[PDB]
Amino acid sequence: EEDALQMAVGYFEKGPIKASQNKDKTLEKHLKTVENVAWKNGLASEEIDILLNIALSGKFGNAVNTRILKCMIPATVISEDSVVKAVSWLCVGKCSGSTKVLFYRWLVAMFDFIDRKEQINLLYGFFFASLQDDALCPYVCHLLYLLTKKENVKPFRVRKLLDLQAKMGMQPHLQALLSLYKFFAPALISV
Amino acid sequence: TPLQKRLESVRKQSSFILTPPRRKIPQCSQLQEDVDPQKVAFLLHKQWTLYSLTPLYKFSYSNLKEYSRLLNAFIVAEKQKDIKVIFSTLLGMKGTQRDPEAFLVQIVSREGKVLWTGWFCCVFGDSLLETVSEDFTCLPLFLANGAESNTAIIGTWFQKTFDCYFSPLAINAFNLSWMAAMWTACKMDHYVATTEFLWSVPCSPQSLDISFAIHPEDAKALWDSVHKTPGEVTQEEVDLFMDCLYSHFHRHFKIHLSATRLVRVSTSVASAHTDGKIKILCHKYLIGVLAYLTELAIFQIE
C-alpha cells in the first residue's frame, strides 16, 4: 500500500488540488501512520525524496511533515540523492528556504546511512556552493564536515570559505569546517 | 654509529668524569666570512631569552620562504584564537665549518618594527653535530627577544613542523660564575659596562638581591691576581675569582655571598642571567659567548 499510496499522491501531483476530489493531506497522513510503523523502503524513500520537493504540491508544511519522518528504513541509495540534487537545484520551485533547511537537516541526520558515501563526496562542490546561503550554512557546514575528503579541498574552496568567514560572522559551523580543512592540506591555518 | 654514539655521549656525561675544564679565554673573534654588520650589530645589544632547542628534523636552509609563510599564517591564526615573518640565515654564526648555519626568525610588524626576532644558532656545537643523522639540522640554541607569548607560539609551530622542542635554557650559578670569570679574562678594550654580578640570598620570607658591580678594570686587575695559567681558565681560577669577590664582600658587609646564588653577571663582554632572559651581547666576542651557550644547550639536550 505504501508504494500504491504514494503513486496516489503522484496522481494528486498531476492535477490541481481544487480539481481533486479527495484531500491531498489525508493520504499522506495515512502514509505518516505507516512511517510510524515503517518509514520508507529504499525505493520508496528514493521516490518520496525525488518527486515531493521539485515543483509539485509538496506544501511547505506537507513536504516538511513528510521530511520529518521521511527517513529510510534500510538506508539511502545513490538514486535517492541523484534526483534530489535537482531539488538543491534552487530555482522557480527551489523547495523554499524552510523546506531547504529541513532538507539539509535531513541530509546531515541521515548521513550515517548511505550505501556509497563516495558518490556524495564526489558531489562535494554542489553542496559547497550552496553554503553561500545564510539559512543553509549551519547545516551545509555539518554536511560538508561529514562529506569531506582530501580531493575536495581545492584551494579555491579554501579561499571561498575564508571569504565566507570574512563576509559573515565568526560561527562554530564555519570554524569546524575551517579546522577540518586545516586538518587536510594546510592552505589555511586556524586553531 | 648514528644513535649509539649519542648513547655513549649521554653515558659519559652522566658518568661525571672530572669536569673542571681548562676552557680557553674567549678570543677576539674577527667577524668571519659574510656576517651582515647591520644584522649582527642588531643582535648584540638585545636581551635574548635563552632556550635549548633540539635538532630540527627535515630542516633545510633552502626552503626559507615557505616556512616563513607557514609560520606567518600560524602567528596570525593564534591571534584569531599586520604581521610578517622573515626567516634569515646569518651565514657566519658558526664555530666550525661543518656547523649548521644560524638562521633568524623575525616577527616584523607597516615598517620594520621587529617584534620578536627569534634566533637559532649552532656555534662550536660539534658534540651534537656528530651525534645526529643527516636529516637533523641540530641548532641547540634558541634566542628569542620578543614577548614570551610569541615565543611560546612560534615554539609550538616549530614543534609541530620540525619535531624540535624548546627547553628553556637556565644557566645555573656555576656556569654563570664561569662565564663571569672568562668574560673579565678577555683582552677587550674600552669596557662598555661595569662588571656586575647580581646575587640573590636564599631567604624564605624576603627576596633580597645584591649587585656586586665591579669597575670593569678593577675586575680585570682582580682577575689577574687569580690568573696563573695563561690561555686557559681553571675551575680553581674561576673559584678563586669568585672567592676574591666573596672575601671582599664579606670583608665589608659580613654576609657570605658564597651562601647566595648568582642570578645575573653583567660584563663588558656579555650580560648573562639565570632564569633564561640571559644573553645581552654587548661586545663582539659573541662567537665564544654563544659557543658556551650552545655547549650548555647541548648539555640540556644530551
CSV table of C-alpha atoms in Angstrom, one decimal:
chain,number,residue,atom,x,y,z
A,1,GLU,CA,0.0,0.0,0.0
A,2,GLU,CA,2.9,2.4,0.8
A,3,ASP,CA,4.1,2.4,-2.8
A,4,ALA,CA,0.5,2.5,-4.1
A,5,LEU,CA,-0.4,5.3,-1.7
A,6,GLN,CA,2.5,7.5,-3.0
A,7,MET,CA,1.5,6.8,-6.6
A,8,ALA,CA,-1.9,8.0,-5.5
A,9,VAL,CA,-0.2,11.1,-4.2
A,10,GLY,CA,1.6,11.5,-7.5
A,11,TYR,CA,-1.9,11.3,-9.1
A,12,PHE,CA,-2.7,14.3,-7.0
A,13,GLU,CA,0.5,15.9,-8.3
A,14,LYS,CA,-0.6,15.7,-11.9
A,15,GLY,CA,-3.7,17.8,-11.2
A,16,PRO,CA,-4.7,20.8,-9.2
A,17,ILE,CA,-5.7,20.4,-5.6
A,18,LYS,CA,-9.1,22.2,-6.2
A,19,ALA,CA,-9.9,19.8,-9.1
A,20,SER,CA,-9.1,16.8,-6.9
A,21,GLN,CA,-12.0,15.0,-5.3
A,22,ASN,CA,-10.1,13.8,-2.2
A,23,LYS,CA,-7.8,15.6,0.2
A,24,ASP,CA,-4.1,15.7,-0.5
A,25,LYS,CA,-3.3,15.5,3.2
A,26,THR,CA,-5.3,12.6,4.4
A,27,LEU,CA,-3.5,10.1,2.2
A,28,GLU,CA,-0.1,11.5,3.3
A,29,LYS,CA,-1.3,11.2,6.9
A,30,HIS,CA,-2.1,7.5,6.4
A,31,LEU,CA,1.5,7.3,4.9
A,32,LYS,CA,2.7,9.1,8.1
A,33,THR,CA,0.9,6.5,10.2
A,34,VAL,CA,2.7,3.9,8.1
A,35,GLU,CA,6.0,5.7,8.8
A,36,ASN,CA,5.3,5.4,12.5
A,37,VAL,CA,5.5,1.7,11.8
A,38,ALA,CA,7.8,1.6,8.8
A,39,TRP,CA,9.0,4.9,7.3
A,40,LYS,CA,10.3,4.2,3.7
A,41,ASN,CA,11.9,1.4,1.8
A,42,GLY,CA,15.0,2.3,-0.3
A,43,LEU,CA,13.0,2.6,-3.5
A,44,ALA,CA,10.1,4.2,-1.5
A,45,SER,CA,12.5,6.6,0.2
A,46,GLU,CA,14.1,7.4,-3.2
A,47,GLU,CA,10.7,8.1,-4.8
A,48,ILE,CA,9.4,10.3,-1.9
A,49,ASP,CA,12.7,12.1,-1.9
A,50,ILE,CA,12.7,12.9,-5.7
A,51,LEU,CA,9.2,14.0,-6.5
A,52,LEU,CA,7.7,15.6,-3.4
A,53,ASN,CA,10.1,18.6,-3.4
A,54,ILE,CA,10.8,19.6,-7.1
A,55,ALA,CA,7.8,21.6,-8.3
A,56,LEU,CA,4.6,19.8,-7.4
A,57,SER,CA,2.1,20.2,-4.5
A,58,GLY,CA,4.8,19.5,-1.9
A,59,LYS,CA,3.4,22.0,0.6
A,60,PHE,CA,6.0,23.6,2.8
A,61,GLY,CA,4.1,22.1,5.7
A,62,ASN,CA,3.1,18.9,3.9
A,63,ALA,CA,6.6,18.4,2.4
A,64,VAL,CA,8.2,19.0,5.9
A,65,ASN,CA,5.5,16.9,7.6
A,66,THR,CA,6.9,14.0,5.5
A,67,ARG,CA,10.6,15.2,5.6
A,68,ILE,CA,10.5,14.9,9.5
A,69,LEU,CA,9.6,11.2,9.2
A,70,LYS,CA,10.7,10.6,5.6
A,71,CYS,CA,13.9,8.8,6.8
A,72,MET,CA,14.9,5.5,5.3
A,73,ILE,CA,14.0,2.0,6.6
A,74,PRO,CA,17.1,0.2,5.2
A,75,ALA,CA,19.4,3.0,4.1
A,76,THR,CA,19.6,5.7,1.4
A,77,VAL,CA,20.8,4.7,-2.0
A,78,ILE,CA,22.6,6.6,-4.8
A,79,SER,CA,19.4,7.2,-6.8
A,80,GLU,CA,17.9,8.9,-3.7
A,81,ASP,CA,20.4,11.8,-3.7
A,82,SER,CA,20.7,12.0,-7.5
A,83,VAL,CA,17.3,13.5,-8.5
A,84,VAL,CA,17.2,15.4,-5.2
A,85,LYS,CA,20.4,17.1,-6.2
A,86,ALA,CA,17.9,18.5,-8.7
A,87,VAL,CA,16.0,19.7,-5.6
A,88,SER,CA,19.0,21.6,-4.4
A,89,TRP,CA,18.7,23.0,-8.0
A,90,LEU,CA,17.2,26.0,-6.2
A,91,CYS,CA,15.1,27.7,-8.9
A,92,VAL,CA,11.5,28.7,-9.8
A,93,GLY,CA,10.4,26.0,-7.3
A,94,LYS,CA,13.6,25.8,-5.2
A,95,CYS,CA,12.0,23.7,-2.4
A,96,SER,CA,11.7,27.0,-0.5
A,97,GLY,CA,14.0,28.0,2.3
A,98,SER,CA,12.2,26.4,5.2
A,99,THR,CA,12.0,23.0,3.4
A,100,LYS,CA,15.5,23.6,2.2
A,101,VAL,CA,16.7,24.0,5.8
A,102,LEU,CA,14.8,20.8,6.6
A,103,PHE,CA,16.3,19.1,3.6
A,104,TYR,CA,19.9,19.9,4.7
A,105,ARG,CA,19.0,18.9,8.2
A,106,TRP,CA,17.8,15.5,6.8
A,107,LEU,CA,21.0,15.2,4.8
A,108,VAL,CA,23.0,15.7,8.0
A,109,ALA,CA,20.9,13.4,10.2
A,110,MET,CA,20.5,10.6,7.7
A,111,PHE,CA,24.1,11.0,6.5
A,112,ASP,CA,25.1,7.9,8.7
A,113,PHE,CA,23.0,5.8,6.2
A,114,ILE,CA,24.3,6.0,2.6
A,115,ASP,CA,25.2,2.9,0.6
A,116,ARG,CA,28.1,4.8,-1.1
A,117,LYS,CA,29.3,7.9,0.7
A,118,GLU,CA,31.9,8.2,-2.0
A,119,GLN,CA,29.3,9.2,-4.6
A,120,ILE,CA,28.0,12.0,-2.4
A,121,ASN,CA,31.6,13.0,-1.7
A,122,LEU,CA,32.0,13.4,-5.5
A,123,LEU,CA,29.0,15.8,-5.2
A,124,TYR,CA,31.0,18.0,-2.8
A,125,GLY,CA,31.0,21.2,-4.7
A,126,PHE,CA,27.3,21.1,-5.3
A,127,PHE,CA,26.7,21.4,-1.6
A,128,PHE,CA,29.7,23.6,-1.1
A,129,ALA,CA,28.3,26.3,-3.4
A,130,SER,CA,25.0,26.1,-1.5
A,131,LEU,CA,26.9,27.2,1.6
A,132,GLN,CA,26.8,30.8,0.4
A,133,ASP,CA,23.2,30.8,1.6
A,134,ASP,CA,22.8,32.1,5.2
A,135,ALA,CA,19.9,29.9,6.0
A,136,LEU,CA,21.6,26.7,4.7
A,137,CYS,CA,25.0,27.5,6.2
A,138,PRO,CA,24.6,26.0,9.7
A,139,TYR,CA,23.5,22.6,8.2
A,140,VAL,CA,25.5,22.6,4.9
A,141,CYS,CA,28.6,23.1,7.1
A,142,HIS,CA,27.7,19.9,9.1
A,143,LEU,CA,27.0,18.0,5.9
A,144,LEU,CA,30.4,19.0,4.4
A,145,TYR,CA,32.0,18.1,7.8
A,146,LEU,CA,30.6,14.6,7.2
A,147,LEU,CA,31.2,14.8,3.5
A,148,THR,CA,34.8,16.0,3.3
A,149,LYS,CA,37.8,14.3,1.7
A,150,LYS,CA,41.3,15.4,0.5
A,151,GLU,CA,40.1,15.6,-3.1
A,152,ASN,CA,37.5,18.2,-2.1
A,153,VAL,CA,40.0,20.7,-0.5
A,154,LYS,CA,40.9,22.6,-3.7
A,155,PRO,CA,42.4,26.0,-2.9
A,156,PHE,CA,39.5,27.9,-4.4
A,157,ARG,CA,37.2,26.2,-1.9
A,158,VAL,CA,39.6,27.2,0.9
A,159,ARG,CA,39.5,30.9,-0.2
A,160,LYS,CA,35.8,30.6,-0.7
A,161,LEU,CA,35.4,29.5,3.0
A,162,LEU,CA,37.7,32.3,4.0
A,163,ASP,CA,35.6,34.8,2.0
A,164,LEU,CA,32.5,33.4,3.8
A,165,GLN,CA,34.2,33.8,7.2
A,166,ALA,CA,35.2,37.4,6.4
A,167,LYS,CA,31.8,38.4,4.9
A,168,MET,CA,29.8,36.6,7.6
A,169,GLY,CA,30.4,36.3,11.3
A,170,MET,CA,32.6,34.0,13.4
A,171,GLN,CA,30.5,30.9,13.5
A,172,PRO,CA,31.1,27.4,15.1
A,173,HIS,CA,29.9,25.7,11.9
A,174,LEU,CA,32.4,27.7,9.8
A,175,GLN,CA,35.0,27.3,12.5
A,176,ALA,CA,34.5,23.5,12.3
A,177,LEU,CA,34.8,23.5,8.5
A,178,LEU,CA,38.0,25.6,8.6
A,179,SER,CA,39.7,23.5,11.3
A,180,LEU,CA,38.9,20.4,9.2
A,181,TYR,CA,40.3,22.0,6.1
A,182,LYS,CA,43.4,22.8,8.2
A,183,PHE,CA,43.5,19.1,9.2
A,184,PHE,CA,43.7,18.5,5.4
A,185,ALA,CA,46.2,20.2,3.0
A,186,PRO,CA,47.1,23.3,5.1
A,187,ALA,CA,46.3,26.2,2.7
A,188,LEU,CA,44.8,27.9,5.8
A,189,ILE,CA,45.7,27.9,9.5
A,190,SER,CA,43.3,28.2,12.3
A,191,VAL,CA,43.2,26.9,15.9
B,1,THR,CA,77.2,4.9,14.8
B,2,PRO,CA,74.2,7.3,14.4
B,3,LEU,CA,72.3,6.7,17.7
B,4,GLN,CA,74.5,4.5,19.9
B,5,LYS,CA,77.1,7.3,19.7
B,6,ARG,CA,74.6,9.6,21.4
B,7,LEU,CA,74.0,6.8,23.9
B,8,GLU,CA,77.7,6.7,24.7
B,9,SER,CA,77.8,10.5,24.9
B,10,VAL,CA,75.0,10.6,27.4
B,11,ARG,CA,76.6,7.7,29.4
B,12,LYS,CA,79.9,9.6,29.6
B,13,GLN,CA,78.2,12.9,30.6
B,14,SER,CA,76.2,11.2,33.3
B,15,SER,CA,79.3,9.2,34.4
B,16,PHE,CA,80.6,12.6,35.5
B,17,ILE,CA,84.3,12.1,34.8
B,18,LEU,CA,86.3,15.1,36.2
B,19,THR,CA,84.9,18.2,34.6
B,20,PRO,CA,86.9,21.2,35.7
B,21,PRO,CA,87.5,22.2,32.1
B,22,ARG,CA,90.6,24.3,31.2
B,23,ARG,CA,88.4,26.4,28.8
B,24,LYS,CA,90.4,28.9,26.7
B,25,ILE,CA,89.9,32.6,27.3
B,26,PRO,CA,87.4,34.0,24.8
B,27,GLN,CA,89.4,35.1,21.9
B,28,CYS,CA,88.9,38.3,19.9
B,29,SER,CA,86.8,36.9,17.0
B,30,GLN,CA,87.3,38.7,13.8
B,31,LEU,CA,83.9,38.8,12.0
B,32,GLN,CA,84.2,35.8,9.8
B,33,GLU,CA,83.2,35.5,6.1
B,34,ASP,CA,79.8,37.2,5.5
B,35,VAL,CA,78.3,38.3,8.8
B,36,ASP,CA,75.8,41.1,8.0
B,37,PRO,CA,77.2,44.1,10.0
B,38,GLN,CA,73.8,45.7,10.4
B,39,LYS,CA,72.1,42.4,11.4
B,40,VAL,CA,74.9,41.2,13.7
B,41,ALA,CA,75.1,44.7,15.3
B,42,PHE,CA,71.3,44.4,15.7
B,43,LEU,CA,71.7,41.1,17.6
B,44,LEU,CA,74.4,42.4,20.0
B,45,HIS,CA,72.8,44.8,22.5
B,46,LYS,CA,69.5,42.9,22.6
B,47,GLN,CA,68.4,40.7,25.6
B,48,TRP,CA,68.0,37.1,24.4
B,49,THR,CA,65.8,34.7,26.3
B,50,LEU,CA,67.9,31.6,26.3
B,51,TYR,CA,66.4,28.3,25.1
B,52,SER,CA,67.8,24.8,24.4
B,53,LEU,CA,66.3,23.7,21.0
B,54,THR,CA,66.5,20.0,19.9
B,55,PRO,CA,67.6,19.4,16.3
B,56,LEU,CA,65.2,20.5,13.6
B,57,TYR,CA,64.0,17.4,11.8
B,58,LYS,CA,63.7,17.7,8.0
B,59,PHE,CA,65.0,21.2,8.1
B,60,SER,CA,66.6,22.9,5.1
B,61,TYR,CA,68.2,26.3,4.6
B,62,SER,CA,66.8,26.5,1.1
B,63,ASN,CA,63.0,26.4,1.9
B,64,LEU,CA,63.1,29.7,3.8
B,65,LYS,CA,60.1,31.4,2.2
B,66,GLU,CA,57.6,28.6,2.5
B,67,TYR,CA,58.5,28.1,6.2
B,68,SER,CA,58.1,31.8,6.7
B,69,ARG,CA,54.7,31.7,5.1
B,70,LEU,CA,53.6,28.7,7.1
B,71,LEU,CA,54.7,30.4,10.4
B,72,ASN,CA,53.2,33.8,9.4
B,73,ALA,CA,49.8,32.1,8.6
B,74,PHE,CA,50.0,30.4,12.0
B,75,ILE,CA,51.0,33.5,14.0
B,76,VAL,CA,48.0,35.5,12.8
B,77,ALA,CA,46.0,32.3,13.3
B,78,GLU,CA,46.8,32.4,17.0
B,79,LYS,CA,45.5,36.0,17.0
B,80,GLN,CA,42.3,34.6,15.6
B,81,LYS,CA,42.2,32.2,18.6
B,82,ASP,CA,49.8,43.1,10.2
B,83,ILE,CA,52.5,40.5,10.9
B,84,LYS,CA,55.4,39.4,8.7
B,85,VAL,CA,57.8,36.5,9.4
B,86,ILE,CA,61.2,36.6,7.6
B,87,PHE,CA,63.4,33.6,8.1
B,88,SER,CA,67.0,34.9,7.7
B,89,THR,CA,70.2,32.8,7.6
B,90,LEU,CA,73.1,34.6,9.1
B,91,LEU,CA,75.9,32.9,7.1
B,92,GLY,CA,78.6,33.4,9.7
B,93,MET,CA,77.4,32.5,13.2
B,94,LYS,CA,79.1,29.1,13.4
B,95,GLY,CA,82.2,27.8,15.2
B,96,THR,CA,83.3,25.1,12.8
B,97,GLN,CA,82.8,25.0,9.0
B,98,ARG,CA,80.6,21.9,9.5
B,99,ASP,CA,78.2,23.6,11.9
B,100,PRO,CA,74.6,24.3,10.8
B,101,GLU,CA,74.3,27.9,9.6
B,102,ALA,CA,72.5,30.1,12.1
B,103,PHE,CA,69.1,31.4,10.9
B,104,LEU,CA,66.8,34.1,12.3
B,105,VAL,CA,63.0,34.2,12.7
B,106,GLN,CA,61.7,37.8,12.9
B,107,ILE,CA,58.2,38.8,13.5
B,108,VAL,CA,58.2,42.1,11.5
B,109,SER,CA,55.1,44.3,12.1
B,110,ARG,CA,53.9,48.5,8.1
B,111,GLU,CA,57.5,49.3,8.9
B,112,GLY,CA,60.4,47.2,10.1
B,113,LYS,CA,59.2,47.1,13.7
B,114,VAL,CA,60.8,43.7,14.5
B,115,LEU,CA,58.5,42.4,17.3
B,116,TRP,CA,60.2,39.1,18.1
B,117,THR,CA,63.4,38.4,16.1
B,118,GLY,CA,63.9,34.8,17.3
B,119,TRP,CA,67.3,33.3,16.6
B,120,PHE,CA,68.6,29.8,16.2
B,121,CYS,CA,72.3,29.1,16.2
B,122,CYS,CA,74.9,26.2,16.4
B,123,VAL,CA,78.4,27.5,17.1
B,124,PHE,CA,81.2,25.2,18.2
B,125,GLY,CA,78.5,22.6,18.7
B,126,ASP,CA,80.3,19.6,17.1
B,127,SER,CA,79.4,17.5,20.1
B,128,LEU,CA,75.8,17.2,18.9
B,129,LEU,CA,76.7,17.6,15.3
B,130,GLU,CA,78.4,14.2,15.2
B,131,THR,CA,75.5,12.5,17.0
B,132,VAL,CA,72.5,13.5,14.8
B,133,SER,CA,71.8,12.0,11.4
B,134,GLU,CA,71.9,13.9,8.2
B,135,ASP,CA,68.2,14.7,8.3
B,136,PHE,CA,68.6,16.7,11.5
B,137,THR,CA,70.0,20.2,11.4
B,138,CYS,CA,71.0,20.5,15.0
B,139,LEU,CA,70.7,24.0,16.4
B,140,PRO,CA,71.0,23.6,20.2
B,141,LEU,CA,70.5,27.3,20.9
B,142,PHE,CA,67.3,29.3,20.5
B,143,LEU,CA,67.4,33.1,21.2
B,144,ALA,CA,64.1,34.9,21.4
B,145,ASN,CA,63.9,38.5,22.4
B,146,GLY,CA,60.2,39.3,21.8
B,147,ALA,CA,57.3,38.7,24.2
B,148,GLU,CA,57.0,35.3,25.8
B,149,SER,CA,53.5,34.9,24.2
B,150,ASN,CA,55.0,35.0,20.7
B,151,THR,CA,58.0,32.8,21.7
B,152,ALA,CA,55.7,30.1,23.2
B,153,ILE,CA,53.7,30.1,20.0
B,154,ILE,CA,56.5,30.0,17.4
B,155,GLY,CA,58.0,27.3,19.6
B,156,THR,CA,54.7,25.3,19.2
B,157,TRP,CA,54.8,25.8,15.4
B,158,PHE,CA,58.4,24.6,15.4
B,159,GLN,CA,57.5,21.6,17.5
B,160,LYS,CA,54.6,20.8,15.1
B,161,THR,CA,56.5,21.2,11.8
B,162,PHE,CA,60.1,20.0,12.8
B,163,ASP,CA,59.6,17.8,15.9
B,164,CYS,CA,62.1,20.1,17.6
B,165,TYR,CA,61.5,21.0,21.3
B,166,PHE,CA,62.4,24.1,23.3
B,167,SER,CA,63.5,23.5,26.8
B,168,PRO,CA,64.1,27.0,28.4
B,169,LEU,CA,67.8,27.2,28.9
B,170,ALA,CA,68.7,28.1,32.6
B,171,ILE,CA,72.3,29.0,33.3
B,172,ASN,CA,73.0,27.8,36.8
B,173,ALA,CA,75.1,29.9,39.1
B,174,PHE,CA,78.0,27.5,38.4
B,175,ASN,CA,78.0,28.3,34.7
B,176,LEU,CA,77.1,31.9,35.5
B,177,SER,CA,80.2,32.3,37.7
B,178,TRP,CA,82.3,30.5,35.0
B,179,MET,CA,81.2,32.9,32.2
B,180,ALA,CA,81.6,35.8,34.6
B,181,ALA,CA,85.2,34.8,35.1
B,182,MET,CA,86.2,34.3,31.4
B,183,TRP,CA,84.4,37.5,30.3
B,184,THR,CA,86.6,39.5,32.6
B,185,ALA,CA,89.6,37.5,31.3
B,186,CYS,CA,89.2,38.7,27.8
B,187,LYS,CA,91.6,41.1,26.1
B,188,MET,CA,88.9,43.7,25.4
B,189,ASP,CA,89.4,47.4,25.4
B,190,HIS,CA,87.0,50.4,26.2
B,191,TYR,CA,84.9,48.4,28.6
B,192,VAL,CA,81.2,49.0,27.7
B,193,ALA,CA,79.7,48.3,31.1
B,194,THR,CA,80.7,47.7,34.7
B,195,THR,CA,81.2,44.0,35.7
B,196,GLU,CA,78.1,43.4,37.7
B,197,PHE,CA,77.2,40.1,39.5
B,198,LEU,CA,73.6,40.1,40.6
B,199,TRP,CA,73.4,37.8,43.6
B,200,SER,CA,70.2,36.6,45.4
B,201,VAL,CA,70.4,35.4,49.0
B,202,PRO,CA,68.1,32.4,49.8
B,203,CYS,CA,65.8,34.0,52.4
B,204,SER,CA,62.4,32.3,52.8
B,205,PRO,CA,60.4,35.4,53.9
B,206,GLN,CA,62.3,38.0,51.9
B,207,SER,CA,63.9,38.2,48.4
B,208,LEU,CA,67.0,40.3,48.9
B,209,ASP,CA,69.3,40.8,45.9
B,210,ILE,CA,72.9,42.1,45.7
B,211,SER,CA,74.6,43.7,42.7
B,212,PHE,CA,78.4,43.3,43.0
B,213,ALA,CA,79.0,45.8,40.2
B,214,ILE,CA,82.8,46.0,39.9
B,215,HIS,CA,84.6,48.6,37.9
B,216,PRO,CA,85.5,46.5,34.7
B,217,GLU,CA,89.2,47.4,35.0
B,218,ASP,CA,89.2,46.6,38.7
B,219,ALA,CA,87.7,43.3,38.0
B,220,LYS,CA,90.4,42.7,35.4
B,221,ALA,CA,93.3,43.5,37.8
B,222,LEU,CA,91.5,41.3,40.3
B,223,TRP,CA,91.3,38.5,37.8
B,224,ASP,CA,95.0,38.9,37.0
B,225,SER,CA,95.6,38.2,40.7
B,226,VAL,CA,93.8,34.8,40.4
B,227,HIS,CA,95.1,34.1,36.8
B,228,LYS,CA,98.2,32.0,36.7
B,229,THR,CA,97.9,29.6,33.8
B,230,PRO,CA,97.7,31.6,30.6
B,231,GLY,CA,95.4,30.8,27.7
B,232,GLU,CA,93.1,28.6,29.8
B,233,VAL,CA,90.9,29.3,32.8
B,234,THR,CA,90.7,26.7,35.5
B,235,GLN,CA,87.9,25.9,37.8
B,236,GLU,CA,90.4,26.7,40.6
B,237,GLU,CA,91.0,30.1,38.9
B,238,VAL,CA,87.2,30.7,38.4
B,239,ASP,CA,86.5,29.8,42.0
B,240,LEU,CA,89.4,32.0,43.1
B,241,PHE,CA,88.0,34.9,41.3
B,242,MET,CA,84.6,34.2,42.8
B,243,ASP,CA,86.2,33.7,46.2
B,244,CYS,CA,88.1,37.1,45.9
B,245,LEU,CA,84.6,38.5,45.3
B,246,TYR,CA,83.3,36.6,48.4
B,247,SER,CA,86.1,37.6,50.7
B,248,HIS,CA,85.9,41.2,49.6
B,249,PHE,CA,82.2,41.4,50.1
B,250,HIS,CA,82.2,39.6,53.5
B,251,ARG,CA,85.1,41.8,54.5
B,252,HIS,CA,82.8,44.8,54.3
B,253,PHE,CA,79.2,43.5,54.8
B,254,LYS,CA,80.0,40.4,56.9
B,255,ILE,CA,77.4,38.4,54.8
B,256,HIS,CA,78.6,35.3,52.8
B,257,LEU,CA,78.0,35.7,49.1
B,258,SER,CA,79.1,32.1,48.8
B,259,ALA,CA,75.9,31.3,50.7
B,260,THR,CA,74.0,33.0,47.9
B,261,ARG,CA,73.5,32.2,44.2
B,262,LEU,CA,74.3,34.2,41.1
B,263,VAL,CA,71.2,35.4,39.2
B,264,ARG,CA,72.9,37.7,36.7
B,265,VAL,CA,76.5,38.5,35.7
B,266,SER,CA,76.7,41.8,33.7
B,267,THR,CA,80.0,42.2,32.0
B,268,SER,CA,81.5,44.4,29.3
B,269,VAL,CA,81.7,41.4,27.1
B,270,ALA,CA,78.2,40.0,27.6
B,271,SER,CA,75.5,40.2,30.3
B,272,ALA,CA,74.1,36.9,31.4
B,273,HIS,CA,71.1,35.9,33.6
B,274,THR,CA,69.9,32.6,35.2
B,275,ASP,CA,66.1,32.4,34.6
B,276,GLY,CA,66.6,32.3,30.8
B,277,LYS,CA,66.5,36.0,29.9
B,278,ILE,CA,70.2,35.8,29.7
B,279,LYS,CA,72.2,36.9,26.6
B,280,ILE,CA,72.9,40.5,26.3
B,281,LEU,CA,75.8,40.5,23.8
B,282,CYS,CA,77.5,44.0,24.2
B,283,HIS,CA,80.9,43.1,22.7
B,284,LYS,CA,81.6,41.1,19.5
B,285,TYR,CA,83.0,38.2,21.5
B,286,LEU,CA,79.7,36.5,20.7
B,287,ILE,CA,81.2,33.6,18.7
B,288,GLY,CA,82.6,32.5,22.1
B,289,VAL,CA,79.7,33.6,24.3
B,290,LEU,CA,77.4,31.7,22.0
B,291,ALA,CA,79.9,28.8,21.9
B,292,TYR,CA,79.5,28.5,25.7
B,293,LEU,CA,75.7,28.9,25.3
B,294,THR,CA,75.5,26.2,22.7
B,295,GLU,CA,77.7,23.8,24.6
B,296,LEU,CA,75.4,24.5,27.6
B,297,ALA,CA,72.3,23.9,25.4
B,298,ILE,CA,73.8,20.7,24.2
B,299,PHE,CA,74.2,19.6,27.8
B,300,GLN,CA,70.4,20.2,28.3
B,301,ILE,CA,69.7,18.3,25.1
B,302,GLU,CA,72.1,15.5,25.9
